[PDB]
Amino acid sequence: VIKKIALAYSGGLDTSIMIPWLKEHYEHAEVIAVICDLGQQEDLDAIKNKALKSGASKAYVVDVKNEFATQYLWPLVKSGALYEDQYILGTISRPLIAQKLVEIALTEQVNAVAHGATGKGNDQVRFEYSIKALAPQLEIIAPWRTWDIKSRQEAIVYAKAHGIEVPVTPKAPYSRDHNIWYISHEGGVLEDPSQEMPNDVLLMTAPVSQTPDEEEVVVLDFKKGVPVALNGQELSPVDLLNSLNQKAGQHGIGVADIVENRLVGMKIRGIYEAPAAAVLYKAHKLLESLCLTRSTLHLKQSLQQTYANLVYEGRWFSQTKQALDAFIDVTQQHVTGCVKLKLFKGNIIPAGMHSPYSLHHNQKDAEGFINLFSLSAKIYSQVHQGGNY
Amino acid sequence: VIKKIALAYSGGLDTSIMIPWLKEHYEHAEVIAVICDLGQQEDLDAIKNKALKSGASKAYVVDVKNEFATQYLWPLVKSGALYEDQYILGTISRPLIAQKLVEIALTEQVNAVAHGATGKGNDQVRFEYSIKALAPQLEIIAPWRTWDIKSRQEAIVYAKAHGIEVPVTPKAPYSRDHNIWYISHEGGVLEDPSQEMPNDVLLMTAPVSQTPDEEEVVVLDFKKGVPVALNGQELSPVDLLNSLNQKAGQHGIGVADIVENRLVGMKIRGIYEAPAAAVLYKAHKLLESLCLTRSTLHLKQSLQQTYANLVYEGRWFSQTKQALDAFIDVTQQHVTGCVKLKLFKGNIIPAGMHSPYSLHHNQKDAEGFINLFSLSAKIYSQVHQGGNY
Amino acid sequence: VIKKIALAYSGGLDTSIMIPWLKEHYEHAEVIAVICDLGQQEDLDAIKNKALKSGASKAYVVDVKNEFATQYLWPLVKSGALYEDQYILGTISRPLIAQKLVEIALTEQVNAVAHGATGKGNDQVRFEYSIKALAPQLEIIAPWRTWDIKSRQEAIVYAKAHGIEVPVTPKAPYSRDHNIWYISHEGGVLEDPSQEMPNDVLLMTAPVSQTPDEEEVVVLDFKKGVPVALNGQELSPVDLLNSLNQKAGQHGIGVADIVENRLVGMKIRGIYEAPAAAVLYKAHKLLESLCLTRSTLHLKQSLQQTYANLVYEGRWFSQTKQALDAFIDVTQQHVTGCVKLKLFKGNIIPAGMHSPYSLHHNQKDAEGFINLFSLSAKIYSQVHQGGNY
Amino acid sequence: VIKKIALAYSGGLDTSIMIPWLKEHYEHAEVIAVICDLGQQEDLDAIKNKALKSGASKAYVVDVKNEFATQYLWPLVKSGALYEDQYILGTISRPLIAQKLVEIALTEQVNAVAHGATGKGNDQVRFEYSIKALAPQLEIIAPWRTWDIKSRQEAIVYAKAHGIEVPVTPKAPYSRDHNIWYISHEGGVLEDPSQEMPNDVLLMTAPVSQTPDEEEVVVLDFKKGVPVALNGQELSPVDLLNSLNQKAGQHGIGVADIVENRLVGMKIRGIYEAPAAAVLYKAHKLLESLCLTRSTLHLKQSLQQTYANLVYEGRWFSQTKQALDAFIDVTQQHVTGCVKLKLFKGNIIPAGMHSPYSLHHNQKDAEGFINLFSLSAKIYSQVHQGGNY
């Protein structure tokens, strides 16, 4: 019998009404709320209190910002992966949320876990793949796939009948996800790809026309593929991301307006802000061009899409991911050095780089190489004498 | 016996002195100069007269700008290829130069062809692969690999001794290549990747600090993957490239400061200007995200590197390339529509797109998909109970 | 209101009882049976008559052996694809069955189509993906996913109560699929991979221990990647497949005992017979090794898996497949020549090959090629002085 | 100055006359001979004595069979790599020979190393890539690229004039390479792919017609992707290879007659015997089909070609190979179990397998998966109404 349920709790109206909903559809069930700090810059104590006031017996707040950076964002930087060559993969946070949920579930000996992902997007897949990979014995409850609530107004009606406070402010005009790595904006007038990005979307990035008229120099030190210092100051991953997000955001850097293919459904138009991510991706690419051999670089670049698809689809916890990580970690052993960049009006402008492991340093040799490199073409053309290309 | 030689002639000092050198090292050999207009914006009449003055019996001048755009740049645009995810592949001009050299060689009954590529770069490979692929029976002469001339100073001594005009004008600070698609800058202080780009490199692209304070809207119409109209005006490929190069260059767009792996040698640091190419690449990528299925998009993106490497290495005239083109052409059948872009201070900002072939338009279905998509992960975790990722 | 239903009809118990089931669950609905000849070597007039006896208003028998060979098997031979490097892809018949069902559906102006695939295998995916690709407006009815019949014995009870002949013949020990390309055997004791293949599985391939003691020479002529003659006799595709299946089957060739990953579900063990396929695949691989450049061969081999997965998953009718076919077709332009093979006790033994397009025909060149090919390795080893591999 | 040279010494006439040749072209140079036992089953004492009699100051004989099996063949087995899907990569011995040569050279204070690979094949590249990767400071001498000896008779003339014994028996009709993993046969009448393999080629494999009339069962136990026991008996890698080569060779297993693309040159026809390799590859492929997830299997199979090309080209000692190895080692963690095989008349017949990590063990779920899996095709077909595939 289901006596205890752990709920991944966002503090929004949806997951708040899920608490009484769970307690009514699973008679006499206790609900434990799990709240993750990933950098959404919300009042987590207020969210904790709302969980308790909504009927949760316990409400955990776990600060996972450093673990997000070191265990997820740093492997992502090392991979250089961009989904469909465009999307910065901020939904990499979903496996971590699932992992904290399962960890507390097992510590609290709950009979089931629940999440608030809707029945329409990829997020439900990302959560439930991760839960099954970490704890295949745990029952999963997805109230959006079971209940009769279909609109916000219907959720409001339910909240009133079940003692749940309805916030005064409306949900944003756009559906948003926010962590230390990115901010996403979807829905509303954004669903029409024929329409330009409205001027009220951006939250952490200055519009390019409102950026300083003087460039800003940043110097990034990397060790084994990840940044360890900014402007000569060693900083924790979170402090470095925070500082670079502010600096690059002030200079308007990193906004992506893209259409991407979902796994679940068709296509989605979104706006994605990630100033620090764009700067780190640029610096990392620069250093790899100096420190990797041609064959290593080419093989690694050919695996980036595989890595991006895996992360995008929520397959973080899989042996396939572990094997890619092992490959990537070897390629990163010498990606160590210094990159200077100028930030200016939405541009990340290279301003020099160096590495102790830089690989950058006869005429008769060339002729021999040419003759053998082109021998196949010569034989083919002799065989197909007079043929066209 | 070598009675006739066709030379790919640029009008520079090197290929100018090759004319008397060829005539002296092959007694009673006649030298035919071949001059291609690829958009280098030089005085072609002067180059022709200089070839004849230097001792060429004939000097062909061929305007190949439309052939370059329609037979090389348009397939490149359709491919979406960027070498090592950075380089716009302006050396795609080398197979076309070789193609015209061979076409004229064969109508002139020449015994050998010559080119002025140095013994150190990739260009000798690109030229000679193409010549062997198109005319394996033609002997190739590369005087940079043969003669006793070692320095530019030595080439000047030789030129004076043979009546070749050498005006006092200092050595260019950078080695440059220029066609309708791009400008490359290499050598000199650019060789050191720790050194920022000097402020005298750029020739067709405004530094971002001097770009207009008002954005410029461009509207591009594509048909089957290639642009056919700009701002509602149907334009030839050459006119469209010229117009877009001017507009995007004024707004500072398209400069790449990169380190790449050579085929012959190690790494090279270069600055590349390609304003129209950057805009076309952006618009093409946007339209592909709207018009291709996920499976077609992912497969095509996985072949971009193969195509880029093939173009970079000079393997244009190969059955491998023909097979890639046939693949790409199918994927481009519906890449038709309109992309609006804002050009502003080095940025290409999406401003809306639409296509008659846009692919952008249940809760129980999702649950079934989730369960089968995650089934392997569930089984794997049950088998490896207690294991980590 | 559903007035007409087209059903893909095999004559087996399942699709036989689907006729009365459909007629009872869609009142006043007429059922049109569609029977395809793919080489299953059954009495199709008997199947036709049985559909009519069970209440079908029309029963089509479509002879698609020729088109199966030239439109499906010939592209497959040209691709060289084997699913997971093992499986000969006999389920390539499913899109063709769906295609014929849809053509008749459209002609007869039916309101829905039906197929008899179970709710457990990949086949339901292959059928329904194809129907959606060809006729997105047609409703699909899958009785296995709807009716109250759970077991074969329940199906038998249902048949007797609806006038359908079920004579006493025992349950087949294996589930089988048979067409001109292959025979599959699955289920029963084959489900356990720790159990060797029982001695009563094979139907068209002799056990190796009873094969002739004298080898048999076969000579295959290929044109543009497909076989056109056998032992100097030009034969239609179906005649050549029939003859080669007989000859190679007599000599015990082509049995695969394999475990494969499904798309829907986990893993499946099956026995697959395909004697002619194995011989054609061998001859095709030999001719490619003679006629393709290294770069073309390597790229095509890299795409075999993509092609195999696409065919395996039922994605035949897709732009992705069209683009792959255009690639493959270029690579096959010169795969033309003669291959002699000795068939002997399960072995396909090369006995010589030749082609008018065969590509098979200095010390100073080698030194130059070696030095440039190994230059990156030398530089890397100097930078990482003393490091290990 | 070059006072001391280490020579990779095979005992043949070529490397024997290289000893006086080296001493004459490098005045007063000492020559150290290095002889590797890789399983070529020759009289190594006679070879050592011939080296000393030919003028070597020292002749090292090193038994490297276990090092070859554990550090080269076992990684190859784990990779599953077959060059161009055909060639078993017995030239994997070349990096090991180069490794021993360099190891001894650095203990003997030699200034240069020499090898006897000819100026025509891939072997020179394999040797010299490895030497540069392991010891870029060592000068390399390849007498076949420098001396004036062009024929066997010219080598005999030189040997007579320089005190080198000429063997009574001729060189074999075929050029051969032999180690514990394989035997290769090339040259002679084998250069003609239209000609069947002659009946005097095979050395360790029975002709299929001369194999036992009763099958032989073998049972292989694998741990982490490599075999550890045969027929229930734990065996060292060398003993297991020796025993399996004998058993499978007696049953005629493992002969490949192929045409492959060289790196250096065009195409080469060879005969390759590797009985144990074929059996190990089969068993390994079987266990991977049981123990890996679909996504891991497909990704690993996509990297086999990259691995095969790397090995074939002699790039063993590279960071690219190290990164692949790290990938592979993760995938092999659970490739542990038992494979029973029947050996019979050239066939390797599966006879059951099991693993403690085997991954082999609803109707509403399937319908949801089908609808979402095929949604893209449905949307595409609605957009392109009336279009063909």
UniProtKB/Swiss-Prot annotation, chains A, B, C, D:
Gene3D superfamilies: Argininosuccinate synthetase, chain A, domain 2, HUPs, Single helix bin. L-citrulline binds at residues 87, 122, 126, 175, 184, 260, 272. GO terms for molecular function: argininosuccinate synthase activity; ATP binding. PROSITE patterns: ARGININOSUCCIN_SYN_1, ARGININOSUCCIN_SYN_2. It catalyses: L-citrulline + L-aspartate + ATP = 2-(N(omega)-L-arginino)succinate + AMP + diphosphate + H(+). GO terms for biological process: argininosuccinate metabolic process; L-arginine biosynthetic process; urea cycle. L-aspartate binds at residues 118, 122-123. It comes from the Bacteria. Its main location: cytoplasm. Transmembrane segments: none annotated. Its EC number is 6.3.4.5. GO terms for cellular component: cytoplasm. It is found in: Cytoplasm. It is an enzyme of class 6 (ligase). Pathway: Amino-acid biosynthesis; L-arginine biosynthesis; L-arginine from L-ornithine and carbamoyl phosphate: step 2/3. Keywords: Amino-acid biosynthesis, Arginine biosynthesis, ATP-binding, Cytoplasm, Ligase, Nucleotide-binding. Belongs to the argininosuccinate synthase family. Type 1 subfamily. Homotetramer. This is Argininosuccinate synthase. It comes from Legionella pneumophila subsp. pneumophila (strain Philadelphia 1 / ATCC 33152 / DSM 7513).
